[PDB]
Amino acid sequence: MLDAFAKVVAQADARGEFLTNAQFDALSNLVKEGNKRLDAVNRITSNASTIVANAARALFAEQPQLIQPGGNAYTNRRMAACLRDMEIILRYVTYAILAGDSSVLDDRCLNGLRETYQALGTPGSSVAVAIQKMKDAAIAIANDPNGITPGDCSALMSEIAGYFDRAAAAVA
Amino acid sequence: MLDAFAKVVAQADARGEFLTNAQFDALSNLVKEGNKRLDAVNRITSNASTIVANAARALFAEQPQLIQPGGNAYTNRRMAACLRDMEIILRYVTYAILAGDSSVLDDRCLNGLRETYQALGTPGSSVAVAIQKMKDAAIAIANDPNGITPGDCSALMSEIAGYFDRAAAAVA
Amino acid sequence: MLDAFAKVVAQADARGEFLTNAQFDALSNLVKEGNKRLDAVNRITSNASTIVANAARALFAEQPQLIQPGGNAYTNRRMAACLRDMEIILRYVTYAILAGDSSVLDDRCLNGLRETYQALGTPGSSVAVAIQKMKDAAIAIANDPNGITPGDCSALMSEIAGYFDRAAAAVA
Amino acid sequence: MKTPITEAIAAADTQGRFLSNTELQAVDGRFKRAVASMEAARALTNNAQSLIDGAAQAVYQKFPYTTTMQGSQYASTPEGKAKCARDIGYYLRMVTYCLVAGGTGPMDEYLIAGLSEINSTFDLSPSWYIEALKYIKANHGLTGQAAVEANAYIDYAINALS
Amino acid sequence: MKTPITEAIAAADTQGRFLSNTELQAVDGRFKRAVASMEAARALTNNAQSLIDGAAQAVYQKFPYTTTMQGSQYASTPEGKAKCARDIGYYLRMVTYCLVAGGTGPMDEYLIAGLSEINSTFDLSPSWYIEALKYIKANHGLTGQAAVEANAYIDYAINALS
Amino acid sequence: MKTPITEAIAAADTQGRFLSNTELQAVDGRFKRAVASMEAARALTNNAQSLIDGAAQAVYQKFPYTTTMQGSQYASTPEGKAKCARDIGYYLRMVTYCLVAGGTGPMDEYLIAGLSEINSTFDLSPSWYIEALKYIKANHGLTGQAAVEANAYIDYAINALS
Ligand SMILES: *[C@@H](C)[C@H]1C(Cc2[nH]c(Cc3[nH]c(/C=C4\NC(=O)C(CC)=C4C)c(C)c3CCC(=O)O)c(CCC(=O)O)c2C)=NC(=O)[C@@H]1C
Ligand SMILES: *[C@@H](C)[C@H]1C(Cc2[nH]c(Cc3[nH]c(/C=C4\NC(=O)C(CC)=C4C)c(C)c3CCC(=O)O)c(CCC(=O)O)c2C)=NC(=O)[C@@H]1C
Ligand SMILES: *[C@@H](C)[C@H]1C(Cc2[nH]c(Cc3[nH]c(/C=C4\NC(=O)C(CC)=C4C)c(C)c3CCC(=O)O)c(CCC(=O)O)c2C)=NC(=O)[C@@H]1C
Ligand SMILES: *[C@H](C)[C@H]1C(Cc2[nH]c(Cc3[nH]c(/C=C4\NC(=O)C(CC)=C4C)c(C)c3CCC(=O)O)c(CCC(=O)O)c2C)=NC(=O)[C@@H]1C
Ligand SMILES: *[C@H](C)[C@H]1C(Cc2[nH]c(Cc3[nH]c(/C=C4\NC(=O)C(CC)=C4C)c(C)c3CCC(=O)O)c(CCC(=O)O)c2C)=NC(=O)[C@@H]1C
Ligand SMILES: *[C@H](C)[C@H]1C(Cc2[nH]c(Cc3[nH]c(/C=C4\NC(=O)C(CC)=C4C)c(C)c3CCC(=O)O)c(CCC(=O)O)c2C)=NC(=O)[C@@H]1C
Ligand SMILES: *[C@H](C)[C@H]1C(Cc2[nH]c(Cc3[nH]c(/C=C4\NC(=O)C(CC)=C4C)c(C)c3CCC(=O)O)c(CCC(=O)O)c2C)=NC(=O)[C@@H]1C
Ligand SMILES: *[C@H](C)[C@H]1C(Cc2[nH]c(Cc3[nH]c(/C=C4\NC(=O)C(CC)=C4C)c(C)c3CCC(=O)O)c(CCC(=O)O)c2C)=NC(=O)[C@@H]1C
Ligand SMILES: *[C@H](C)[C@H]1C(Cc2[nH]c(Cc3[nH]c(/C=C4\NC(=O)C(CC)=C4C)c(C)c3CCC(=O)O)c(CCC(=O)O)c2C)=NC(=O)[C@@H]1C
């Protein structure tokens, strides 16, 4: 598993190369902004149960077929399995937010996911909706201008949205 | 309704406290970004018709089911409804930008709006899409570097993002 | 396993008590001394290999019967194990130094060790000598006044001799 | 809470319109005036204990019966003197709050609404508080437009008391 | 018990490794954060009784039935009031402990382990304890990173209950 | 690759738990240490050719038989002198990589795993590299915590060869 610093380290090693100042600066500016990355993880994690539960309620409100008898999310075992997937995906996304690199989400969560859903008949389209709803909730919470020193979280928020869209693409 | 300053004051009253010398410094900083805040509001407002109509056109191109007969935005009465909502949300976003605080958007626009659409049969998902398109257009316009004294508006644009993010979160 | 803070918390919970200012103050004082604690672990750890080898060499010179044929440290397998044991004890002592609490050392290293030696035939008195050598070397290295901001680490060096003598007591 | 910004927003929302230049200009005036009003709020905050104790003393010297008349509503006891000093700092604190907000809102919401019911119910006379406010105006040592700002919110409370 | 210091040691112990620079950084981060943490912990310990009472009243108020329904599980008797207030103190004592340790370990071990089993067996609704913690979050008085520290372990309890 | 951040993540994942405050403290400690770390890495990188050329000559001076004894494994040849310099730059590069990552990871994966196998197989002796590392320590010019950071990782390499 790589964090953002290890990713640059590994790319330089494959070339046999010390780092350049462009690379030093890059990473060092990443550090300088680090408090914002901690607030984002703290904010999404601290609200995970709400993010999952509202996203799930929204999804089944939009796609009622999922919870009709016979629906892929009907019965309590399949509903809880759905909710579990929603927490797991949110979990691995926040891991990636902390790392600054997709690799932990990619290796331990996304790889093989689409084939998994294609195997159980779970509609990956609908998983994708659930992921986009969690994305909108998480970005609102993390980017919430209330209750935090004001500053520019914009590059970071584009990164977070990146990880969520990457999940959504992966499951459908 | 609170603006940024009124919020600091109401937080301090609940404590029975005068403001700190640190807090006053923080407030000087708000005052200093004054001109940029006005630019952003002027710029978004002066282009509101375009922002709304381009966003709505893009939405109906992506989601033609909305304008199929039977669709939620079919009939001129419903289409006008839809554009009115878009207009309203943007108006309330622009108010939050003037205020430097989300409370006017949250109290007069967002609170109860998910339940409203759920009850109407309006797909909040699609509404969130219209809000994201208005978002990307508004920020591009407010942060357009031509025809303005050059400088750095990144924080202000981070904050503006936050108000759109709340909006889009709130409608599913 | 507990650290100094968790031990106080575990004491307090057994009584259903919030902490007293006594304890708050004590733990706060450990935190302001924390830089020294980190210097000591890094210093001992960065010299681990030579602390162990010098101590082993010194033990065998005082106790050549251990390496005569038939002795406990004779053959390379037994020599490796003795050296290993020395590394293991030192490492857990350094865990205890970081934690500010002997519990990790007690639970995971010292508990049952005396009986293990009695079983195998290993002279625990000689292990205690080996441990007391590593202590003298480790403290002298941790408390070297060269290449470090000057100050008094006497309180800490006493704590550290604490963990070595505890360990030596437990095998002897 | 009334401030120049919430008035501007409240204007346009009542008419269901976007903000216009009409409202942006008013907010700009508020940003411009903030230099002087935050100087005033800081100076009063920094000097607050002495202003408060000095105001209380001005009240007692002007109305000495407040320190001798027997009754919970008077400062004739250790506790009535604490109550009074407390109230006077409330007043000063709300002036600083108006200055920070750029408007009467904080004082309007937290103090003036209900003011006269409370003074009547609890037999507190408005003239006591007016003298304390006069004392504060006379001794905050501010100058220039920072003075003008502080005095505007003090004379506003005095009006409310009259 | 889980703290940043035990996680660090546990990490190295599990690789049978001496501590490295990787781990000492974690401990220094904890040492620096302890300033906000220990401050939040002291504040809630000082204000404990009032947060606890305020919290129970907040709960009895959002769930009026908890005080009318007969049933040993309800605060509809003096015994159930004392059970409920005892419980709320337990939650608060657990936040304080997490602040002192710099981690969730104490709450995990002493309250979250088996939490679901108890609330089910004894018919205690999670919503009640969640309201209580919401009240504590809203009324502890903290600002800055001390507040951040208290609400993280409060929101962690809320999550556990959700 | 072992860093303070991947280790914090690894700990949560092993327990199936979202990240907690426990872990965020670890990473903050990493971020604050990173100031010293990249200074040292910058200084070592900017002056690597000197450190490398001087650490090689340092080994030759202490083990001058490595300059003359016949064999592949010796810096007896041009090719050998070039290998030795190559190896030393590898250790230096890895030291800088650890400073960038704030942990032993890069050195562990790229150099230490298999280290004993390679030195035994190609009859290279650890004390050779130990002396080169001693030289780097002695001449990086670093001061303050930048120096403590560099030497932590240089001593780690040395421990590994011992
Ligand atoms: C985008 C995420 C939003 C922000 C973020 C933002 N935060 C800060 C300051 C800041 N954040 C922390 C938080 C932590 N430090 C830790 O060690 C941990 C883990 C326990 C956390 C959660 C601190 C300590 C600070 C500095 C103190 C302060 O309150 O200022 C800033 C200021 C700049 C900076 O320090 O990087 C910003 C911009 N603000 C927004 O407007 C975005 C919505
Ligand atoms: C990000 C928004 C882009 C900026 C903004 C920017 N503006 C200024 C100066 C500036 N802006 C105004 C505008 C107004 N003053 C008012 O009262 C009103 C309401 C009718 C408006 C619209 C003024 C008067 C000024 C000062 C004079 C000038 O024209 O320069 C700056 C300069 C710094 C500052 O004052 O903060 C900047 C940087 N420029 C960019 O490049 C961003 C994309
Ligand atoms: C007895 C142990 C000797 C002392 C120790 C001593 N150190 C300091 C300051 C000090 N130590 C560090 C070390 C670290 N901080 C970290 O995060 C890590 C892990 C990566 C380490 C290894 C730092 C950063 C500092 C602060 C900066 C400085 O160099 O001063 C002091 C000063 C007092 C204090 O900071 O507590 C002392 C006294 N000095 C002696 O003379 C004893 C032999
Ligand atoms: C909810 C948004 C949607 C679901 C989800 C759903 N999933 C399953 C089974 C299921 N899900 C996974 C996912 C993962 N396992 C992992 O280890 C990881 C990463 C660590 C992930 C992301 C697996 C492996 C499985 C199969 C095993 C199991 O069910 O326990 C179900 C139930 C399948 C069934 O009962 O046939 C469901 C319902 N379904 C929807 O309709 C929502 C769109
Ligand atoms: C457009 C992108 C999407 C719509 C929107 C749509 N909305 C409605 C009705 C509607 N919208 C609101 C929202 C508000 N009323 C307020 O006062 C405020 C804040 C001031 C808000 C945000 C309300 C209350 C209503 C009901 C009132 C009405 O119908 O006029 C409709 C029409 C519903 C109908 O006539 O059946 C539509 C179509 N529809 C889409 O398809 C787009 C995704
Ligand atoms: C060296 C200074 C002295 C010895 C040491 C010696 N020990 C052993 C075997 C031995 N030591 C342990 C101790 C531990 N195992 C653990 O996992 C832990 C912490 C988790 C500890 C503290 C064990 C369990 C064993 C038996 C297992 C094994 O040998 O692999 C020997 C081997 C004796 C033999 O093989 O017959 C020796 C030589 N001997 C001396 O003379 C020194 C005083
Ligand atoms: C001081 C100039 C003179 C006093 C003062 C005095 N006041 C009271 C009671 C009192 N004061 C208030 C005022 C406020 N409550 C608010 O919330 C606000 C706005 C933030 C204000 C200005 C109230 C509501 C009350 C009654 C309730 C209470 O005790 O707090 C007393 C004691 C009253 C009594 O118990 O009888 C006194 C003595 N009296 C003098 O003689 C001084 C000149
Ligand atoms: C208060 C918000 C609401 C209650 C409270 C209530 N609790 C109980 C019994 C009860 N509570 C616990 C909780 C804990 N025990 C622990 O050890 C810990 C961690 C340290 C916790 C959080 C337990 C285990 C029990 C049952 C065992 C016991 O009696 O102590 C009652 C009475 C239940 C009964 O006797 O049947 C009540 C009333 N009920 C409400 O209505 C309040 C809203
Ligand atoms: C220099 C201090 C002394 C040497 C140097 C020397 N080394 C070799 C061969 C050699 N070195 C390595 C080391 C590494 N390979 C890696 O991938 C890494 C981490 C990235 C390291 C540290 C290896 C694996 C090898 C063997 C394979 C190869 O040739 O690359 C030689 C030549 C050995 C031979 O040809 O038999 C020499 C001379 N010897 C001295 O006398 C110097 C004092």
Author numbering:
A (entry chain B), B (entry chain D), C (entry chain F): 1 to 172
D (entry chain C), E (entry chain E), F (entry chain A): 1 to 162
Report text from the authors:
In contrast, the structures determined in the rhombohedral and orthorhombic space groups compose a stable dodecameric molecule. Two hexameric rings associate turned towards each other into a doughnut-shaped superstructure. The interaction surface area covers more than 61 000 Å2, with a ratio of surface-exposed versus buried area of almost 1. The free energy for the assembly is calculated to be approximately 500 kcal mol−1 and indicates another driving force for this large stable tertiary assembly. This superstructure has not been seen in the crystal packing of any C-PC and is very likely to be connected to the natural assembly of the phycobilosome rods, although this assumption needs further in-depth investigation using other methods.
The unique crystallization properties of the antenna protein C-phycocyanin (C-PC) from the thermophilic cyanobacterium Thermosynechococcus elongatus are reported and discussed. C-PC crystallizes in hundreds of significantly different conditions within a broad pH range and in the presence of a wide variety of precipitants and additives. Since phycobilosomes are naturally organized in the cells, the in vivo C-PC assembly exhibits a tricylindrical core, from which six rods composed of three PC hexamers radiate, in order to assemble superior rigid antenna-like structures to expand light harvesting.
